[PDB]
Ligand binder design. Structure first.
Ligand SMILES: OC[C@H]1O[C@H](O)[C@H](O)[C@@H](O)[C@@H]1F
Lengths: 572, 30, 106
């Protein structure tokens, strides 16, 4: 209804025909700057736009600390974990944990956990973000939007989009980033510049604050006013919506796990020609990860200023009309902006490129999850299976995960008060800390063994499910309509649960390892941090970097850290 | 009552002192 | 309920002079102030909102400024047609409240 003009239609059609044509033509080598660009592109998706703009609208700029935390963990990736992967001779984290502990149940568990994280944090998130963009662009309901998104993704994957991805992934993401720069310019022009945003944001509230529902009635100002600390990164340790101790400590765990264990992130990182190129690309990626504050978060705050009745809706029936869920409509923040600030030419291009990146992400995750299920899960249940059977099983798995993610769509839509980024970060905080703790203990504690690692993973899974399952079964609740969750199971912030779960699963790992047999030295050479410089052979790839460029790249990590530390204190 | 740039410079100074400690320890003993 | 106060009930300026009409909010409204003009026989017309954003069509003579609780509407070159009642409204919270209205005469 908004892109229903000749210019937007022409640009969308031309871009989709271009992607189809590039897909039809498609039918350790990288250097530092493609490495950094690829890391940034792999991390940044349309779910990031939706979530970061939505949380900027709902709560202010503290969510920027979610991206700004990533600089230091990307440094951890370049300086600590990429060397571990190269020294071990492995390309994934499951491969490292198979070499480090042996067995086959740790890898099987990690494959199952990765499948669940694909469904929850990747497939349903991308489907929901595409649906939100399509609903804001066309007025369609979320189910029609998701069916159309799946159909265009099917066209895209039957037309060789997987083959064209290896060329166009990073380029497409950075075209999206240029479009986001243009939209940031338009948005800051709408509010009167950078200082206009901070003039206006605290005064931006909806005037529709009374519900016809007798239970709700007049909504309190606390539920519809902007937070008094909206302009602050570091929020109150207990009453803050993003408490600073949580954001500083427990986000490191979850970010650590993302950057240092993600198969795609590590594969992009390990493609560097040398380790110096890997570290320089990590520096570039970290520098790039300061941009979502101004490209997504602040535009979301601007969207709250511009559309307070829609973005900052507070009465449940109004919110249900605005976006489909009664818990709030901050997720429409970035889409609406794209739909209403971009002109008749750039709006269609921005939507088309965002949706094509969506489609690529979906197709990539579909393929990766299907291969993961076929190789790590299905071939264990059926040891010897034919090629045709594996193809059929992969296709049926894609069908199954699509159905499950469509069923999970209302949950993603309503979760965390209708805040997508909080949903992603909460699921990650419930499922990642066990893996982070086990990986850290594997690196730095040689005494940790297969028993300890596996039972730490299982105990962490149980402890994280004891919070995740009640958090989703007690439903979605907002400030207006609080959920019945007993407030010791949901009132602690999910990044505090990240810390607790990390240390409890690590404690379980250590306790089980100490009461079980240890792994002799001969198996651990170049697999634990204590033996990374061990030339001895082991039982069950180049770390060298030129000293001249090693000092150059190290000072550039210090300079990047100082820039990020300035920005943390600037917006504190 | 510090300005945002004052807070940024204070954070940078604290970070540089911390890095100076983490380098001087190595300069003394690994 | 925010109270908007216009200290001067009445301002007289010559044609070509500059006039500042002040409004004071009872609390800190985050520049969430609109200015309306009402000529004798007419209904109010929006001049400014967000304390500085001119409404579509209003001349550049009408300039809004202010922050916190203190806001001003300035007419840089008053024309003989500028005589009216100028109202400040807060759009910070609901209910919307108006200032008493300052009568600018020539
Ligand atoms: O789950 C942790 C991850 O959350 C988001 O994706 C952030 O943009 C990443 O920087 C972070 F590593």
């Amino acid at each position: 209804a908004l892109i229903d003009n000749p210019a937007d239609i022409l640009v969308i059609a031309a871009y989709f025909l271009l992607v189809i044509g590039v897909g039809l033509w498609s039918m350790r080598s990288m250097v530092w700057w493609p490495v950094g660009a690829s890391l940034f592109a792999s991390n940044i998706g349309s779910g990031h736009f939706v979530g970061l703009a939505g949380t900027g609208a709902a709560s202010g700029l503290a969510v920027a600390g979610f991206e700004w935390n990533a600089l230091f963990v990307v440094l951890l990736l370049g300086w600590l974990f990429a060397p571990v992967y190269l020294t071990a001779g492995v390309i994934t984290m499951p491969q490292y944990l198979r070499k480090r502990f042996g067995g086959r149940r740790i890898r099987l568990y990690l494959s199952v956990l990765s499948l669940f994280l694909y469904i929850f944090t990747k497939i349903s998130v991308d489907m929901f973000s595409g649906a939100v963009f399509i609903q804001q662009a066309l007025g369609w309901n979320i189910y029609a939007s998701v069916i159309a998104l799946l159909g265009i993704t099917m066209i895209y994957t039957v037309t060789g989009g997987l083959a064209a991805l290896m060329y166009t992934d990073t380029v497409q993401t950075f075209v999206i980033l240029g479009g986001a720069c243009i939209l940031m310019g338009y948005a800051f022009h709408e509010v009167g510049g950078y200082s206009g945003l901070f003039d206006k944001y605290l005064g931006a509230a909806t005037s529709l604050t009374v519900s016809e529902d007798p239970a709700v009635g007049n909504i309190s100002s606390f539920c519809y006013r902007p937070r008094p600390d909206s302009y602050h990164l570091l929020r109150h340790p207990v009453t803050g919506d993003l408490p600073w101790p949580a954001l500083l400590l427990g986000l490191t765990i979850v970010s650590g796990w993302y950057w240092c264990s993600d198969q795609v992130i590590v594969q992009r990182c390990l493609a560097g020609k040398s380790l110096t190129h890997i570290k320089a690309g990590c520096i570039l990626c970290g520098y790039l990860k300061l941009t979502p504050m101004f490209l997504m978060v602040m535009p979301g705050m601007i969207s709250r200023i511009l559309y307070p009745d829609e973005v900052a809706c507070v009465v449940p029936e109004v919110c249900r009309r605005v976006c489909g869920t009664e818990v709030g409509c901050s997720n429409i923040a970035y889409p609406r902006l794209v739909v209403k600030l971009m002109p008749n030419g750039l709006r269609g291009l921005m939507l088309a490129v965002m949706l094509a990146a969506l489609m690529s992400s979906l197709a990539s995750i579909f393929n990766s999850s299907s291969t993961l299920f076929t190789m790590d899960i299905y071939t264990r249940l059926r040891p010897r299976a034919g090629d045709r059977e594996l193809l059929l099983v992969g296709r049926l798995w894609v069908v199954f995960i699509v159905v499950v993610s469509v069923a999970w769509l209302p949950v993603v839509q309503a979760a965390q008060g209708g805040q997508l980024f909080d949903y992603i970060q909460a699921v990650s905080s419930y499922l990642a800390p066990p893996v982070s703790a086990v990986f850290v203990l594997a690196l730095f504690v040689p005494r940790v063994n297969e028993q300890g690692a596996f039972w730490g993973l299982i105990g962490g899974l149980l402890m994280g499910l004891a919070r995740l399952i009640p958090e989703f079964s007690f439903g979605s609740g907002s400030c207006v309509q609080p959920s019945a969750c007993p407030a010791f199971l949901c009132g602690v912030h999910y990044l505090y649960f990240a810390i607790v779960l990390f240390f409890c699963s690590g404690l379980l790992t250590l306790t089980v390892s100490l009461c079980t047999a240890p792994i002799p030295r001969k198996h651990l050479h170049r697999l634990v941090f204590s033996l990374r410089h061990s030339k001895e052979e082991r039982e069950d790839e180049d770390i060298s970097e030129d000293p001249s460029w090693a000092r150059v790249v190290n000072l550039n990590a210090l300079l990047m850290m100082a820039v990020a530390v300035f920005l943390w204190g600037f917006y504190a | 009552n510090l300005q945002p740039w004052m807070q940024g410079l204070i954070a940078v100074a604290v970070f540089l002192v911390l890095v100076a400690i983490a380098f001087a320890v190595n300069h003394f003993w690994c | 309920x925010x109270x908007x106060x216009x200290x001067x009930x009445x301002x007289x300026x010559x044609x070509x002079x500059x006039x500042x009409x002040x409004x004071x909010x009872x609390x800190x409204x985050x520049x969430x102030x609109x200015x309306x003009x009402x000529x004798x026989x007419x209904x109010x017309x929006x001049x400014x909102x967000x304390x500085x954003x001119x409404x579509x069509x209003x001349x550049x003579x009408x300039x809004x400024x202010x922050x916190x609780x203190x806001x001003x509407x300035x007419x840089x070159x008053x024309x003989x047609x500028x005589x009216x009642x100028x109202x400040x409204x807060x759009x910070x919270x609901x209910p919307x409240x108006x200032x008493x209205x300052x009568x600018x005469x020539x």
